[PDB]
């Protein structure tokens, strides 16, 4: 028998009125979305796996017979097991909701499963979910084009964001450059979407810098007072500041995102991930993968888990969709891989918490911590042999002479279990005032299992 390749062509039997298309492609993976009037044509393939090609149409093609709203067609070498499955699953996705925002929630949760546990099933499912979300939007938008014009930015930016994260989990450098091409950049931008738009189109950061700085500053002031902040607007502000912040902006930003990523906030991000990845997850409450990534995966708290992939995904997500590729690593290159938590200093230095003490460096071993889960605090400045422990001291003055002594200091709480609970930057005299009083974090409320440190732009003291 002569060795030959067997190639089949399948032609969709109606012409498609094409509205949008996008493709991301490298040797490892391919992902294409084609949108037409009442048409989705989607092709996804991972190297060494069978391609998946799916069509969703509002119309049913004439079938030869013996004498929901949409129709799903699957092209490929699926045996009955995967063929019956794929057809039923893809139809269940498209008919789940006529609301494009609920479809987008499901697309975010499916992309989250793919970043956390990369593999062919989660990659193909998340590619399908993104395509169906864009299709349901396109179908609603088709009807009233003037009313839909403000909602285009959210879908377009998420298509760029989700495709980038999915293509990297598949081993490719880039997601879609654009889906709804030329359309989104022409639409007026609402104030609530300014930071998202600056990220989506890679706009000159200069007119949005004060806005980004104020977003970060205010998010932090709220966090420390126990108030919720806009974590999505925070994500886009951080993205702008790490790409084109003035001197010391990137450093000030990462101190604040670290401070906002409390141990409690980190556990909330892990609980939210679990709830989003649940097979019984419902989209009555909207979900964005930015709700898990911001503040924690854009912070210098590295430790929490079965979701270390989140940090790397968020650092990738931070690059605009219009030197080190990682803007977090770019802002503070001195921070090592073994750092549980870092607090950036002036002069290319940072405080660094680790389990094991550094070699040839000044370090403090922290008192009152379990021997199996220890805490070493070191300063990483670009050889010391001495065994250091932090000096026990009380807080003087307590006088308010319009001079801030504890300004630029970090108040740190740690447990006997060896977890850094809180990391409070004292940025104002107002905060310094609350530190002496009896906000919430620095006044006493918790028992004799929690210790506290004052970290200076020099050395370390144990309070009280």
């Amino acid at each position: 028998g002569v060795r030959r390749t067997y190639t089949t062509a399948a032609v969709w039997p109606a012409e498609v009125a094409v509205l949008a298309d996008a493709e991301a492609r490298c040797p490892a993976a391919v992902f294409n979305v084609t949108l037409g009037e009442a048409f989705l044509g989607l092709r996804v393939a991972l190297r060494s796996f069978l391609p998946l090609e799916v069509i969703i149409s509002a119309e049913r093609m004439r079938m030869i017979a013996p004498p929901g709203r949409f129709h799903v067609y699957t092209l490929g070498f699926l045996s009955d097991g995967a063929m019956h499955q794929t057809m039923r699953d893809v139809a269940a996705y498209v008919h789940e909701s006529d609301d494009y925002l609920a479809q987008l929630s499901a697309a975010h949760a499916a992309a989250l499963a793919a970043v956390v546990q990369p593999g062919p099933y989660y990659f193909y499912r998340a590619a399908v979910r993104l395509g169906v979300a864009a299709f349901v939007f396109s179908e609603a938008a088709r009807r009233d084009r003037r009313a839909s014009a403000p909602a285009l930015l959210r879908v377009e930016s998420d298509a760029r964001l989700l495709s980038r994260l999915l293509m990297r989990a598949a081993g490719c450098p880039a997601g879609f450059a654009g889906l709804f091409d030329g359309r989104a950049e022409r639409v007026p931008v609402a104030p609530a979407d300014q930071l998202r738009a600056a990220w989506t189109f890679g706009e000159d950061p200069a007119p949005r810098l004060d806005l980004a700085r104020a977003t970060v500053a205010e998010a932090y002031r709220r966090s420390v007072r126990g108030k919720p902040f806009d974590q999505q607007a925070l994500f886009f502000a951080v993205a702008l500041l790490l790409r084109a912040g003035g001197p010391g902006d990137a450093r000030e930003t990462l101190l604040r995102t670290t401070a906002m990523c409390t141990a409690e906030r980190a556990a909330a991000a892990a609980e939210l991930t679990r709830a989003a990845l649940s097979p019984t997850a419902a989209w009555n409450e909207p979900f964005s993968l930015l709700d898990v990534l911001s503040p924690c995966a854009v912070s210098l708290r590295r430790d929490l888990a079965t979701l270390a992939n989140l940090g790397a995904a968020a650092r990738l997500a931070l690059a605009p969709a219009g030197e080190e590729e990682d803007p977090v690593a770019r802002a503070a290159p001195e921070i090592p891989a073994e750092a549980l938590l870092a607090l950036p200093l002036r002069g290319g230095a940072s405080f660094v918490f680790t389990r094991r003490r550094p070699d040839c460096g000044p370090a403090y071993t922290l008192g009152g911590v379990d021997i199996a889960n220890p805490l070493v605090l070191a300063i990483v400045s670009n050889c010391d042999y001495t065994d250091r422990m932090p000096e026990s001291q009380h807080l003087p003055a307590t006088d308010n002479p319009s001079v801030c002594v504890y300004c630029d200091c970090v108040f740190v709480r740690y447990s006997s279990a060896g977890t850094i609970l809180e990391t409070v930057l004292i940025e104002s005299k107002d905060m310094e005032e609350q530190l002496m009083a009896g906000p919430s974090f620095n006044p006493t409320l918790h028992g004799g299992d929690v210790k506290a440190l004052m970290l200076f732009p020099n050395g370390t003291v144990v309070d009280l």
């Epitope: 104030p191 609530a192 104020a214 977003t215 998010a219 709220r222 126990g226 108030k227 919720p228 607007a233």
Partner: antibody, heavy 118, light 112 residues
Framework: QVQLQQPGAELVKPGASVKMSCKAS????????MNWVKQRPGRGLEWIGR????????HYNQDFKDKVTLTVDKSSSTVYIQLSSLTSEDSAVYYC???????????WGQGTTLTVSS | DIVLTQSPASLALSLGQRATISCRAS??????????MYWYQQKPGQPPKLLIY???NLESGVPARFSGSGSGTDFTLNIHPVEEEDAATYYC?????????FGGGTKLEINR
């Protein structure tokens, strides 16, 4: 889209109280302060106060402290302003305005026209 | 209380010309590198619309003919070139300290 929804009108008798509402949608309700602003026919703007819907923290203009109470209903995403002992001096358009993180008023309701009249 | 004084109370200009509106604060509204100064446009039957935040930053969707400048006590709104849709009242506003206040307004009218 961010929307602040206010009823168009309130007709109230002198000496009575009024509660005006501002229903917020299209953003995280508890992440932003809500302001109230008074405008009398053909006159300027007066800032009344602001409320944080997350914890009910208020800041008031001292001129309005005895006249005005701000409250929220988190479950309906609604901010209320209550005015007591109404006079014709209180007849005005009352705007709700969301505080942006830059500390300007970035989104506004259409305003409630309050008429104090028998 | 910080009092904001606008000048002029009214401005009449031809299309294509420069509108300059001043706001003077009784005390400084600048602290820690920021000026807590805002400009709004209002047309009859409409709420005010934010044009400029933190003295000098153009709000999203505001045409580039609008600009703001100043620090401390003295602030300016510029409109150049003025267009027909610029006929409106303009207010300055501060968020420096309690109470937050607005200027008295400047009505801009077009000569044609």
């Amino acid at each position: 889209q961010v929307q602040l929804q206010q009823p168009g009108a309130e007709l109230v008798k002198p000496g009575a109280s009024v509660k005006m509402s501002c229903k917020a949608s299209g953003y995280s309700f508890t992440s932003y302060w809500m302001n109230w602003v008074k405008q009398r026919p053909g006159r300027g703007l007066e800032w009344i106060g602001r409320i944080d819907p997350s914890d009910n923290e208020t800041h008031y203009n001292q001129d309005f402290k005895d006249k005005v109470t701000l409250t929220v209903d988190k479950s309906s995403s609604t901010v209320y302003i209550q005015l007591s002992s109404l006079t014709s001096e209180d007849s005005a358009v009352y705007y709700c305005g969301r505080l942006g993180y830059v500390y300007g008023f970035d989104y506004w309701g259409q305003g409630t026209t309050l008429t104090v009249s028998s | 209380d910080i009092v904001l004084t606008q000048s002029p109370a009214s401005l009449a200009l031809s299309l294509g010309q420069r509108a300059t509106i001043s706001c003077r604060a009784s005390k400084s509204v600048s602290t820690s590198g920021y000026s807590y100064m805002y400009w709004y446009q209002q047309k009859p039957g409409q709420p005010p619309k934010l044009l400029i935040y933190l003295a000098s930053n153009l709000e999203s969707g505001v045409p580039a003919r609008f600009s703001g400048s100043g620090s401390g006590t003295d602030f300016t709104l510029n409109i150049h070139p003025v267009e027909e849709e610029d006929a409106a009242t303009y207010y300055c506003q501060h968020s420096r300290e309690l109470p937050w206040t607005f200027g008295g307004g400047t009505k801009l009218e077009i000569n044609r």
